[PDB]
Structures are given as C-alpha cells and as structure tokens.
C-alpha cells in the first residue's frame, strides 16, 4: 500500500461513447489490481509541446491512488494495452518542496 | 523493504528483557532477517554484486557477535542458532 | 535447458537431449490420436520422390487445432502439456468448459490451469486467438492463418513467432520468422505469443543413430557418385565440382532463385528476407 499518481493521455478525436468506455476500462482495471482511487484531476484536452501519436491535440486524465507496491507495474502494462491509450506514467507520491 | 512492524515483531521476541533494543541476540536476529531477505533477493537477481558485498559484511558481523556470545555464554548461544535455524 | 552427458561413450560426449521440463502428462489423449501412415518418401506411384527417408520410430498423429475460431467465446483450461513426436513444438491439451477437448501448439509461457479463449472479444494474452485486426500492433503472435478461415500456416515451429508491423487497409503487415514482410488479411486468426521450446535448436544429435531414429537415412554426396548418377559424379581420384555446382537433376544449386516469377502471391509480399 503506497500512493502513486497515474497520468493517462488519450485520444483527442474520440467519441463521447468511446472516451467513456476507455475511461470505464481504466477505472475497471484499477479496481482489479487493488488500486483504491484517492482523487481525480481530469483536465480534458489541454494541447501539447510535440505531436504524440502524430496528434498535436491530446486528452489528459490523472488519478492519485493507493495500491499494493508489488502490483503497479503490471497495471501500467494493462493500461497501455489499449489502442487509444497513448501515454501512461505512474509516479510515486512525494510531498511537495518549494522555492522562495 | 522490511517494515517497522516486522522489525518490532522480531525485536520484541528476541529482546532479553522487556525494553531491550541492542543485545547481541537481538542484533543477530535483526541481521538474520535482513540477511535472509538479501539471500532471496540474490537467488533471484544473481547479477547484483554490489548488494552481494553487503551480504558478506552482514554475514561477517553476525559471525563476530555470535562468537562473542558463545565465549561469554554457551547455552544462550546454542539457544539462538537453534531458535533462528542457523549455523549449518 | 539441453541435458548434456558425460562421455562414457564416444557419441555420448557431444550428444544432447531436451529437458522435457514443461511436460506434465506423458501418454496422449486416446480420443485425439490417429495413426500416421509412414511413406518412406514414396508417393502413390511407389516411387521415391524424396530421398534419404525412412525407418523412423513409429508415431501416432496427435490431431491439432489450427482453426480455433471453430469455437469462439468458449473459454478453456490448460489440462496438460505433452510431447508431440510430429513437430518441433510442444502441444497443450485444452479442456474447454464445453467438455470438448482439443490440442494446440503450446506457446511459450503457458502454464497448466491457465485460461485461454479465442475471438475478437478476447483479452490479449499468451494462448488466445484473435483475428489479426484486433491484435495490437507490435505484439508477437504465432500460428497465423494466411488466408481467412483456411487454417494456421505461418509460425508453427519451435521457437518461431511473427510480429505485427502495422495495418494497411483490409490487411495487416507481418514480419514472418524468415524476415519476410508480408501483407496478411486482417480477418486471419493468429494466436498471441511465441511458439515454445525455443531451445530445440540447441540440440546436438550426437551420433548417426539418432538421425536414423528420426527417420533420416544417410545422404550421399554427388561427389561420391558416378556420372550416370549425378553431375558431380566421377573423375579419377577425388575431384572439385568442375562446373557450377548442381542438383542431381542438373539445376544449379548455389544462388539460383527458384520461386515462380509471376505468382499472384506477390503484390502481398512487401520485402523478401533477410540477410
């Protein structure tokens, strides 16, 4: 049990239907590995520095979660597994550090 | 890694008196735990030598303690390696 | 793993056998075998049309499922892993939940008690079969159909596998075990994973006998013949080829490209192999 925060980038051009289904499959999968969601920051589109998937546009999710340490890596695989899923980056949760 | 509960779990078991933290038997059991975890780490990744170094240092330390314990009190020595399943 | 031997006899020195590790059950499904008529490379004319062939150990053919879309959506459990004398690969015994039992060429990594299934809806995991169009590009896959519903042809041999390089129109683009890049119909079933027993290749037969057990009779060089027999036949006392090296039939055997010029099959062949 540790705190990580998944960052998913998805297809800009998706259906409300499509998007919802992926958003489902995602939420689904998290449950299966023993991920408990502690938050979501979902930002919708928010365009880019460089063309991920030949696509200046990109669709950003994010979730601050709590799951068993052992199971995280597999999750990220199961996440990338989707044709629409484009980036997945998981990062362990580290209390902020500030300047001036 | 080992987590504080796991440690304390063992620690309280081997402690000679209720408040004991140091105390050769404890120190031993502490190493012993971190050793056997390292062993299994190594059985898996055989390609990690730097970590292996540690193991030898740990095993080394445990040895010294064990000896000292033995030449002060036998019994209490012979009690520990059997209780820890050690020295083959 | 390639079990080795001490050299308590001359042949035993270099000979090596497989480890048979992944093998769970040792006699075949009685319902699933059927005899293999042994030809000795003779055709229905009586005539040897393939040389140096015969005398192997007797074998029962294990019936294999190269279709798999035969049963869509019905999951199955892995009952065992068995030795198949007819192929380089190992076979997996499936118990379908239907109650019907089939064999498949065992992919690498299958364990007993795993669940596999076939079809579009199928999770992408070792042992499952989907039409190629639903298979993520860059995944490695085996036992691939070539034309739709015609049965698996590509990548069945031990250790082999083929990879999906991209889709184009109704087709996906595969890199076959040879390195050929072939367009292959999207509708074609492939099954995710690589063929198991990738250690096959490391086997050193070790003695003439072993070859003879596998049904392979001694091969004789054209050099060792006479002109009646072979292009390289004759010449007094041990000679060099003495013309471009040829087959007994007289066609050139180094480099001479033999695939048919006009084959409709091209136009799906993107790039020849390999290196």
């Amino acid at each position: 049990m540790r705190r990580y925060e998944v960052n998913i980038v998805l297809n800009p051009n998706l259906d409300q239907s499509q998007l919802a289904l992926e958003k489902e499959i995602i939420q689904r999968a998290l449950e299966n590995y023993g991920a408990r969601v502690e938050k979501v920051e979902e930002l919708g589109l928010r365009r880019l520095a460089y063309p991920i998937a030949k696509d200046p546009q990109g669709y950003f999710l994010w979730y601050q979660v709590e799951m068993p340490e052992d199971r995280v890596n597999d999750l990220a695989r199961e996440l990338r597994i989707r044709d629409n899923v484009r980036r997945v980056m998981v990062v362990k949760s580290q209390e902020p550090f500030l300047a001036n | 890694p080992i987590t504080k509960e796991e440690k304390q779990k063992v620690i309280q078991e081997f402690a000679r008196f209720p408040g004991d933290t140091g105390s050769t038997e404890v120190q031993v059991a502490l190493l012993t735990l971190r050793i056997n975890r390292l062993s299994e780490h190594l059985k898996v990744h055989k390609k990690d030598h730097h970590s292996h170094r540690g193991l030898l240092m740990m095993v080394g330390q445990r040895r010294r303690l064990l000896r000292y314990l033995q030449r002060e009190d036998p019994e209490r020595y012979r009690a520990l390696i059997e209780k820890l399943g050690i020295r083959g | 793993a390639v079990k080795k031997f001490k050299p308590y006899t001359p042949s035993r020195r270099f000979m090596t056998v497989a480890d048979f590790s992944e093998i769970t059950k040792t006699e075949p499904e009685k319902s699933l075998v059927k005899p293999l008529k042994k030809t000795g490379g003779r055709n229905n004319q009586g005539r040897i049309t393939v040389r140096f062939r015969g005398g192997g150990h007797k074998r029962l053919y294990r019936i294999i499922d190269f279709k798999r879309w035969d049963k869509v959506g019905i999951p199955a459990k892995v009952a065992a892993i068995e030795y198949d004398p007819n192929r380089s690969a190992r076979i997996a015994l499936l118990h379908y939940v239907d109650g019907e039992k089939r064999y498949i060429i065992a992919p690498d990594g299958l364990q007993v008690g795993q669940q596999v299934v076939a079809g579009p809806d199928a999770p992408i995991q070792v042992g499952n079969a989907l039409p190629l169009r639903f298979i993520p590009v860059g995944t490695v896959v085996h036992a691939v159909e070539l034309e739709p519903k015609k049965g698996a042809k590509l990548a069945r041999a031990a250790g082999t596998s083929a990879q999906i390089q991209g889709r184009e129109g109704d087709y996906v683009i595969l890199r076959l075990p040879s390195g050929e890049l072939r367009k292959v119909h999207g509708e074609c079933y492939a099954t995710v994973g690589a063929v198991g027993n990738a250690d096959h290749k490391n086997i050193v037969l070790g003695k003439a006998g072993r070859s003879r057990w596998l049904g392979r009779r001694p091969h004789v060089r054209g050099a060792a013949m006479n002109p009646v027999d072979h292009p390289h036949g004759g010449g007094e006392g041990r000679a060099p080829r003495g013309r471009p090296p040829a087959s007994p039939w007289g066609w050139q055997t180094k480099g001479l490209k033999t695939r048919k010029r006009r084959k409709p099959s091209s136009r799906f062949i993107i790039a020849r192999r390999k290196k």
């Binding site: 520095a49 460089y50 991920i52 980056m89 580290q94 550090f97 500030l98 300047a99 001036n100 | - | -």
Partner: protein, 68 residues
C-alpha cells in the same frame, strides 16, 4: 533576470504546471543553467528531474528551432 525572483513561492515537485515550469527553459527549450535560474544546488536537481517528466508528458518541449 533571476527567474526564482521574477516568480513567487512555488513547488517544483509538481510537474504539471506548464505555466510555472516553461519560464525555466531558454527559447530553444534547453534547461536553463544555474546562472540564469537563480536556483540553488539541491533545487536545480529537483527541478530538471521534474521538468523531464513533464517533457515526457508532452507539456514542455524537448526542443525548438531558433528564430531571428
């Protein structure tokens, strides 16, 4: 122009504000030296460590062509 001054109190661990972050790269997208950032030692580490993470996210550029 020391950018730690020109900005305000902010956490560089959080990698997601392309706003706060993008001030910290030269026009070309090159991470800015310690001279230009006005950052300390320990800071500059935690900075680019997170910058890269974001560049991977797609929020910051890896590069840009120089304009005249």
């Amino acid at each position: 122009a020391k950018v730690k001054a020109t900005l305000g109190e902010f956490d560089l661990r959080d990698y997601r504000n392309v706003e706060v972050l993008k001030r910290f790269l030269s026009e070309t997208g090159k991470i800015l030296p310690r001279r230009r950032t006005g950052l300390s030692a320990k800071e500059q580490r935690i900075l680019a460590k997170t910058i890269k993470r974001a560049r991977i996210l797609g929020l910051l550029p890896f590069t840009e062509k120089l304009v005249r």
